[PDB]
Design a binder for this molecule. Sequence first.
Ligand code: NA
Length: 206
Amino acid sequence: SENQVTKVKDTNIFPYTGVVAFKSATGFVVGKNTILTNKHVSKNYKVGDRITAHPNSDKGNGGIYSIKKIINYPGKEDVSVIQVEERAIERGPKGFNFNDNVTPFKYAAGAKAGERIKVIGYPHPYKNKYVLYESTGPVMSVEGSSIVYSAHTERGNSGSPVLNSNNELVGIHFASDVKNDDNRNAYGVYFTPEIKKFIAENIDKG
Ligand code: NA
């Protein structure tokens, strides 16, 4: 089957440099000192909790950062903006500045049923290891703030970016059908104008 799930060997190149890890799920960078995740992920975390930038399976990462603010979208969609303190609590390879160690994504022009997407995140938490995966499959439908795709995802993928074939952002993963078969739908939030505005409003001003 051409819908594949594979481990990402090196996480220090684009697009993996846009992805972050919480203790047990995923997020991704949207702007200066600012990450996007799901509300069902951010509910587990508080001010002072830590996130790790694109950790690899061999103790390497882009630094460890402290949460400074959590802003939950007041609408129904499963979207949460998290701001971090700019200076790392564990230096990244490109220095202490969060923004020097990570890369935000460009929004795609849109998405259509049938196109290939890629969900990038940490599907399963491990004792003292982070294992980044990429999972591919087709878009099934796009309607309003919903994007549905048939790519394998697990619990830890909550908050993962959903990218098109050219690494442009089409959605944020939040849920999946629990069925055992391969013809299983996964669900993301599609970036409608009011969700894009909410995110833009809540990027750290500096
Ligand atoms: Na979590």
